[PDB]
Amino acid sequence: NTLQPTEAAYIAGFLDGDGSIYAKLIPRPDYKDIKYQVSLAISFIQRKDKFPYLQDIYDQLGKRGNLRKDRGDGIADYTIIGSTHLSIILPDLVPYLRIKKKQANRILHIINLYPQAQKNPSKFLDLVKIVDDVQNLNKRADELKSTNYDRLLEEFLKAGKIESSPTGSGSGSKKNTLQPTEAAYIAGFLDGDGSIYAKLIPRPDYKDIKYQVSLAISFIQRKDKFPYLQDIYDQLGKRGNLRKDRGDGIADYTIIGSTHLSIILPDLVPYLRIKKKQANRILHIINLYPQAQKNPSKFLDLVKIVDDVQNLNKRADELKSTNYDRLLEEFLKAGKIE
DNA sequence: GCAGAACGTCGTGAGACAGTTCCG
DNA sequence: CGGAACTGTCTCACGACGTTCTGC
Ligand SMILES: [Ca+2]
Ligand SMILES: [Ca+2]
Numbered sequence A: 001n002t003l004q005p006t007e008a009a010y011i012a013g014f015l016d017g018d019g020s021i022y023a024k025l026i027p028r029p030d031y032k033d034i035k036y037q038v039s040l041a042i043s044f045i046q047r048k049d050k051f052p053y054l055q056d057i058y059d060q061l062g063k064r065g066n067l068r069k070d071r072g073d074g075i076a077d078y079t080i081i082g083s084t085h086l087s088i089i090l091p092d093l094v095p096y097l098r099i100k101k102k103q104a105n106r107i108l109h110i111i112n113l114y115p116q117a118q119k120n121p122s123k124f125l126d127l128v129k130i131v132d133d134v135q136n137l138n139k140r141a142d143e144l145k146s147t148n149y150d151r152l153l154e155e156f157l158k159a160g161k162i163e164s165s166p167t168g169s170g171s172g173s174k175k176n177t178l179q180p181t182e183a184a185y186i187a188g189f190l191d192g193d194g195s196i197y198a199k200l201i202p203r204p205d206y207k208d209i210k211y212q213v214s215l216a217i218s219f220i221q222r223k224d225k226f227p228y229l230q231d232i233y234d235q236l237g238k239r240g241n242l243r244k245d246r247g248d249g250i251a252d253y254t255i256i257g258s259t260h261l262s263i264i265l266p267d268l269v270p271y272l273r274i275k276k277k278q279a280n281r282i283l284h285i286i287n288l289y290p291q292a293q294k295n296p297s298k299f300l301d302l303v304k305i306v307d308d309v310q311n312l313n314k315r316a317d318e319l320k321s322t323n324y325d326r327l328l329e330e331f332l333k334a335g336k337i338e
Numbered sequence B: 001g002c003a004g005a006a007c008g009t010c011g012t013g014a015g016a017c018a019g020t021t022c023c024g
Numbered sequence C: 001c002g003g004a005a006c007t008g009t010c011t012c013a014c015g016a017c018g019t020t021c022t023g024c
Helices: A005-018 A048-060 A083-093 A101-117 A121-137 A148-158 A180-193 A223-235 A258-268 A276-287 A296-312 A323-333
Strands: A019-027 A036-047 A066-068 A075-081 A194-202 A211-222 A241-243 A250-256
Touching: A005 A019, A005 A036, A005 A048, A005 A083, A005 A180, A019 A101, A019 A121, A036 A048, A036 A083, A036 A101, A036 A121, A048 A066, A048 A075, A075 A083, A083 A101, A101 A121, A121 A148, A180 A194, A180 A211, A180 A223, A180 A258, A194 A276, A194 A296, A211 A223, A211 A258, A211 A276, A211 A296, A223 A241, A223 A250, A250 A258, A258 A276, A276 A296, A296 A323
Parallel strands: none
Antiparallel strands: A019 A036, A036 A075, A066 A075, A194 A211, A211 A250, A241 A250
């Protein structure tokens, strides 16, 4: 079972980003009495091309659960179903989990009560409540609230499985301090819900080269989960910009400029997976930018790194960035290189 | 002259299941 | 009977910026 602290932390970061912890009950037209089995799962979702990364997480989790290279729409998932695997896996992830920690504790709890709850409609209903919380915790505010417990209490009374009086508790409307696991999580989360990117900004008032290469990493999330960004922000020495809302209900945390990324990135690189290349390329740009400012020749092949980064932030089929082709044209016609 | 902050935004890349097929 | 695997998708929650807006 011995899964490494920074491997557990990364996965939790990644799960909190691109994963899902959830509970559901399945109709079972062949079960003894209670015709529902409560299903429990965690999953990791990602685009087809990044499958090796899922396959890697799989291998770390003792090769439990079922991988899927393609689920139909060029997109891949790794679902771990059942209490056998989850009672081994979740204990390892729960300490590092943040956004979905509650969901994980709930699943872990359902596991504890399931044996007894299994052939007792009273204790099954009480457990179905926990299935409700989990599905609710995965919901928005404005969304319809989970009514599995209500629909089953009605089903149990009609099927004569429960006598008076019924339960219960349901809404019945009838300097650094960035340590290994701190960085590992953040890298997990950035790999999931984050972005590492470079861009050319047109600056209509520069000495010679009228562009500046802008460098950034960002974190994106729904506004309700903003405090979690506010956490990562604090943990990174309080660098960069935060938005509680950018206008469309989704928050972001953006760290622009070599100054911050010279400090932050080296902390995340060793734990970064999906976005590690982008990270190093940014560091590389930071590394050879001083000399690149004056010389249009050194600016150009540095502008290639920008293209390369933007390329990495695309699938193979997308049209590849042409900043190098456009600036080469511009520099020739401005006589800056000939 | 320099560069970060803030604003706004296509076009997908996810989340979180519900069903349904296998399976000892 | 018991429950996990595999199929399939609807609805946003993201990404990765182009823009432009301050700030010394
Ligand atoms: Ca997410
Ligand atoms: Ca992602």
